[PDB]
Amino acid sequence: GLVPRGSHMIPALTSNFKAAEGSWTATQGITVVRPEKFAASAQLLVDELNAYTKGTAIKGATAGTGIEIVLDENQKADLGAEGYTLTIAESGVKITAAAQRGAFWGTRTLSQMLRQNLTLPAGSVTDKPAYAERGVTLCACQINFSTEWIDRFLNEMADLKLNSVLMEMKLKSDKFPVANTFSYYSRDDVKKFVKKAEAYGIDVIPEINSPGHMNIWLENLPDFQLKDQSGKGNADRLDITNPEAIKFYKTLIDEYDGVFSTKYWHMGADEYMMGASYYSYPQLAKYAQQVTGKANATGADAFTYFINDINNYVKAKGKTLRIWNDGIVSTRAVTLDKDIVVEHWLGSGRSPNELANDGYKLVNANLNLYFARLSPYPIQKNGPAFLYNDPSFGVDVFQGPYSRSIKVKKAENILGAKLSIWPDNGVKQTENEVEADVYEAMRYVAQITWGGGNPADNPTYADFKEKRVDKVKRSPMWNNINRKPLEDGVYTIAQPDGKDLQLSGNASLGGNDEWTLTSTPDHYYQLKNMTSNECLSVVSGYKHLSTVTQVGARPEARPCVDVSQTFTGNQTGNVGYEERNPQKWMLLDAGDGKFKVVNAVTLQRLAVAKGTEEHIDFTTFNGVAKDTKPAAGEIVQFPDDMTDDVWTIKPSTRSISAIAEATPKQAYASKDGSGASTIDVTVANNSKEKVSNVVVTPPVKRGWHIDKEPKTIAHIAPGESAKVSFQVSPEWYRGDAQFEFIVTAGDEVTKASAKVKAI
């Protein structure tokens, strides 16, 4: 419940809620009173209050009774930039803060309380964060995160008072369309979710990792690639000695500035050589000694000179630079600037305690808080308990060499800590699996970064989980989509007032074809063509991280696999993902039976090409030139910003429907037929007209004895059904098998399949 005061919320309050007389109850008669400059930030609470009270009349206004939000600069010394005071009295609720950020966090506390009980005990509490950056690294990199996923994620962060997200991503470039390999994000799309972040007080920081890890930017730009002594390039590394390559990077900085509002730029600066040696690129050492005037300048010096040049470039924009700590290397004739934020993750090189003592501001980008789809980390395998329950772990404990821990003593130079969300393999998990996978870690990190540690009343992680994690539901506004618009069944697929969709090997605009929708636990659909008996998939084309990213890539038919399981944490039993997840499709209700159809892992929309679409992928990729331009009417996948094609999905109209079922499910070779399997096929008249001369033709299959002759049903009446049986027995065939039966009635034709294991 709500008593003891504030014991079921995340983060826990950082001081005690002082009780007062009486209570206050949210009803449909209340108003959220706030100054107009706070309208967008209060909107979340307004929408939630209507959800909680099961009505729609509550509004945000500059006057009224109920919940008052007050922004008062006089409180800046007491509350800081993010603190607030929450006061509950019989007369109403009052949130006071010095700025918008703090007032918003106050509404999250209030919201979590009302999420559990509409009646609140009277009292007051002042709450302030222990650390200024309470963060997440989201690698929306190479593979894509749908805008709907990002929108939900900002709500997840906001309700937990997380306020910083580093987003490694590609923004579609206006000046370099040849480098616009998917994944990319539209400028309007980023502006949108950045606007939501601004309202929720979340600092969205972009990262273009450089001068290494640039495959996604340099694949099609060989002249900006660092070259071997043999002249062999590599899309991973930008030539930092080439003036047009530096211009190319700085141009991307400019393009991002128009959509991101943060004061920070993250250039990455992961170790340049990526494990190689500077001696294989002697033009770096020579470039260094030129810009410094020192004969003994090294390759690492050029690397650092690059960091400093980008530091000056972003500083001239009033921005502050950020780098990964493995970019802090040993130098000679060039010294690393001291006004750069260092995000520490690697237990190597200069210790974080000495970095802090030397004046650097640090983020604990802790390896213990890493997430990956490919190889789950221990926090995924085992949950956060091994950290929560370890009194020697905390935001101020950084990783050191040889598994040692290093406590940063100059605590004022610790900005905070964050968890990290890496793909590594884009098809092993879906994004909807990731949003579930990180659930516990988001709460744990939110708790230790806001509170500075564990709640005083939850000695163990089990207590924290039982009393808080399991009791605090997400905001009711978190979910933003109908996760299952259509129920499982048989449907048709076509264009609005156009041809239907068929698929045999390849897909095309056919006409008159049946499909079977099968929902999945992570809220996707398997699209099974009931004529080809194969499932719609996307597996052919240019790839990143084992995921098809080519624009205009051609969906194709693939063997239908099991789609009933989802995998998080340890991902025990996760096999077959290479076929499963490319087979999965998100279906977004477009109204009036129309549907946006988006692949679950390539995240491009099933589309009908026009012959007028332009993109680099239509001519070349990664130095190899090949034309893949789709022609008018061709079926392809397209990013959201190159197609509006939706698809009409409707339950089938066919007057006939056939179903084939095998009994037993297993068959064995037999000379007397005892090991046979009876495939009963049942035809059904759906509409109102007597169908006659219904012919059922059995399949023919290697190594199986099957009844050769078709069976016929003279007549079947509306709303009736007829049954015919065929017997199948394996000869030399063994293993999984499938039997397809063709049912014909006049001009109409349908199929029914069955499975038999040959043992």
Active site residues: 271
Query: What residue has token string 């009931």?
Result: 530
Q: Give strand pairing partners of 581.
A: none
Q: Are 580 and 558 spatial neighbours (Cβ–Cβ below 8 Å)? A: no
Q: By three-state DSSP, how is residue 501 classified?
A: strand
Tell me which DSSP letter residue 676 carries.
Answer: -
Residue numbers preceding breaks in the chain (C to N > 2.5 A): none
Place of tokens 């910003």: 641
- φ/ψ region of 175 (left if φ > 0, alpha if ψ in -120 to 50, else beta) reads alpha
Please list the residues that pair with 23 across neighbouring strands: 121
Rg of the chain in Å (alpha carbons): 30
The closest alpha carbon to 758, from 739, 727, 733, 728, belongs to 733
The upper half-sphere exposure of residue 163, i.e. CA atoms within 13 Å in the direction of its Cβ, equals 23
**2 C-beta neighbours (distance < 10 Å), count:** 18
Task: Give a three-class secondary structure readout of 387-449.
Answer: HHCCCCCCCCEEECHHHCEEECCCHHHEEEEEEEEECCCCCCCCHHHHHHHCHHHHHHHHHHH
Report the relative pairing of strands 84-89 and 119-127 from DSSP bridges. antiparallel
Instruction: Say whether 139 sits in a helix, a strand or coil.
Output: strand
Rounded-to-10 torsion of CA 624, 626, 630, 635: -60
The vertex-663 CA angle with 660 and 668, nearest 5°, equals 120
**Measured between alpha carbons, how far is 162 from 139 in angstroms, rounded to an integer?**
17
Residue 421 in tokens: 């969300």
Give yes or no for a contact between 722 and 682, defined as CB atoms under 8 angstroms apart.
yes
DSSP code per residue over 517-549: EEE-TTS-EEEEETTT--EEE---S-EETTEE-
Buried residues in 21-48 as b, exposed as e (16+ CB within 10 A)? eeebebeeebbbbbeeebebbbbbbbbb
Size (the chain), residues: 759
CA proximity to 752, closest of 667, 654, 669: 654
Give the strand order in the sheet containing 677-685: 656-663, 677-685, 721-730, 704-706
Name beta bridge partners: 679. Answer: 662, 726
- Helix 39-53 / helix 100-116 crossing angle, nearest 10 deg: 0
